[PDB]
Design an enzyme around this catalytic site. Structure first.
Site, PDB file in Angstrom:
ATOM      1  N   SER A 143       0.853  -1.209   0.000  1.00 54.34           N
ATOM      2  CA  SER A 143       0.000   0.000   0.000  1.00 54.34           C
ATOM      3  C   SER A 143       0.885   1.254   0.000  1.00 54.34           C
ATOM      4  CB  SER A 143      -0.970  -0.070   1.123  1.00 54.34           C
ATOM      5  OG  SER A 143      -2.003   0.886   0.904  1.00 54.34           O
ATOM      6  N   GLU A 237     -10.723  -3.927  -4.940  1.00 63.41           N
ATOM      7  CA  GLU A 237      -9.880  -2.843  -4.386  1.00 63.41           C
ATOM      8  C   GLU A 237     -10.178  -1.537  -5.108  1.00 63.41           C
ATOM      9  OE1 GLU A 237      -6.090  -2.908  -2.722  1.00 63.41           O
ATOM     10  OE2 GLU A 237      -5.579  -4.889  -3.532  1.00 63.41           O
ATOM     11  N   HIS A 267      -7.676  -5.457  -0.084  1.00 60.31           N
ATOM     12  CA  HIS A 267      -6.419  -4.701   0.117  1.00 60.31           C
ATOM     13  C   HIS A 267      -5.450  -5.454   1.035  1.00 60.31           C
ATOM     14  CE1 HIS A 267      -4.046  -1.150  -0.083  1.00 60.31           C
ATOM     15  NE2 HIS A 267      -4.152  -0.904   1.214  1.00 60.31           N
TER      16      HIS A 267
HETATM   17  C1  NPX Z   1      -3.983  -9.263  10.621  1.00 61.35           C
HETATM   18  O1  NPX Z   1      -2.806  -8.459  10.646  1.00 61.35           O
HETATM   19  C2  NPX Z   1      -2.745  -7.351   9.844  1.00 61.35           C
HETATM   20  C3  NPX Z   1      -1.494  -6.696   9.840  1.00 61.35           C
HETATM   21  C4  NPX Z   1      -1.305  -5.585   9.078  1.00 61.35           C
HETATM   22  C5  NPX Z   1      -2.346  -5.057   8.279  1.00 61.35           C
HETATM   23  C6  NPX Z   1      -2.188  -3.898   7.481  1.00 61.35           C
HETATM   24  C7  NPX Z   1      -3.219  -3.399   6.721  1.00 61.35           C
HETATM   25  C8  NPX Z   1      -3.088  -2.140   5.870  1.00 61.35           C
HETATM   26  C9  NPX Z   1      -3.552  -0.887   6.605  1.00 61.35           C
HETATM   27  C10 NPX Z   1      -1.676  -1.905   5.325  1.00 61.35           C
HETATM   28  O2  NPX Z   1      -0.786  -1.546   6.109  1.00 61.35           O
HETATM   29  O3  NPX Z   1      -1.496  -2.067   4.110  1.00 61.35           O
HETATM   30  C11 NPX Z   1      -4.462  -4.075   6.748  1.00 61.35           C
HETATM   31  C12 NPX Z   1      -4.648  -5.196   7.496  1.00 61.35           C
HETATM   32  C13 NPX Z   1      -3.600  -5.719   8.287  1.00 61.35           C
HETATM   33  C14 NPX Z   1      -3.778  -6.879   9.081  1.00 61.35           C
END
Ligand code: NPX
Length: 295
Positions: A143, A237, A267
């Site tokens: 991202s 997305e 995403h």
């Molecule tokens: C279960 O663990 C997670 C860890 C990091 C995560 C990061 C994002 C997005 C905001 C990101 O940093 O791209 C989404 C879900 C996520 C779930």
């Protein structure tokens, strides 16, 4: 898609860290969600000063000690941490059979653009200073970190720094104005990313700078001479067209681009690999891609 996708979508429709009312609550929300994915016993984490940027080495049993991915976490340039992304980092370390350097680059709004790119380039230069070989290196990120991966490569190239063997972008954010067609057409199926929160985070990162500033929004950067790029993106997305436009621009610049659209994926679905089969399948593909370019 797997039935498990319904469970991840249901989690994200209720836990909406990008829609929390304050930056503090957005940061805490993502930390709480990451704390659910328990770390395997065989992961070794070592805090390091990566040339003035705080970092953590992530090693697993089959990590080749001379292969390194510099990993740039997502979170809109505003949230995320070593804690939020160490699980995705260890999964990539396992699949690519390498060490991962996970850096704590400066976050907005406290540290606007170009702080993040100053830190990512400094960490890469520090890896070279301490004896890492570019032909055994890669830069990867999700991202905002996927956008930062492209910006880091552009800035390193422009500084005459040797580029790594390959780079990986997971659902990259490269359009800080949210004017891709999918920002409208995929709004009904994206449980995490919408235009309003994206513009909120872009405002904090840009601090009044032109939203087409090339190292902030690499859709507008000169991409000529970049190494082979893997772009993984989900079709459910709003950021789908960020990946499609990045692929178009990189190909027009003569870059060896692989665009991999995963049907119905949301995403950074790879972050949910503990529960989502397509998440682990996509990470295995990242490892295959990296090992092929280190051969
Ligand atoms: C279960 O663990 C997670 C860890 C990091 C995560 C990061 C994002 C997005 C905001 C990101 O940093 O791209 C989404 C879900 C996520 C779930």
């Amino acid at each position: 898609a797997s039935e498990a996708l319904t469970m991840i979508v249901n989690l994200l429709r209720s836990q909406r860290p990008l829609q929390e009312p304050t930056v503090e609550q957005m940061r805490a929300g993502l930390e709480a969600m990451a704390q659910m994915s328990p770390l395997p016993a065989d992961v070794e984490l070592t805090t390091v000063d990566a040339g003035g940027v705080p970092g953590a080495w992530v090693r697993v049993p089959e990590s080749d000690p001379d292969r390194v991915v510099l990993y740039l976490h997502g979170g809109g340039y505003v949230i995320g941490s070593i804690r939020t992304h160490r699980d995705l980092a260890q999964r990539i370390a396992r699949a690519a059979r390498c060490r991962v350097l996970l850096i704590d680059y400066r976050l907005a709004p406290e540290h606007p653009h170009p702080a993040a790119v100053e830190d990512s380039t400094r960490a890469y230069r520090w890896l070279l200073e301490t004896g890492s070989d570019p032909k055994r290196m890669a830069i990867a990120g999700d991202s905002a970190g996927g956008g930062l991966t492209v910006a880091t490569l552009v800035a390193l190239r422009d500084a005459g720094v040797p580029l790594p063997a390959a780079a990986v972008c997971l659902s990259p954010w490269v359009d800080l104005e949210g004017i891709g067609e999918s920002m409208t057409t995929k709004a009904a199926v994206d449980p995490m990313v919408q235009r309003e929160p994206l513009l909120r985070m872009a405002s904090m990162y840009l601090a009044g700078q032109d939203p087409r500033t090339p190292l902030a929004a690499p859709l507008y950067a000169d991409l000529r001479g970049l190494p082979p790029l893997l772009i993984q993106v989900g079709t459910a997305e709003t950021l789908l067209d960020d990946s499609v436009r990045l692929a178009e621009r990189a190909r027009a610049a003569g870059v060896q681009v692989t665009l991999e659209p995963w049907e119905d994926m949301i995403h950074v679905w790879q972050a949910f690999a503990a529960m989502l089969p397509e998440g682990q399948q996509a990470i295995e593909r990242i490892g295959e891609f990296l090992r092929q370019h280190w051969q």
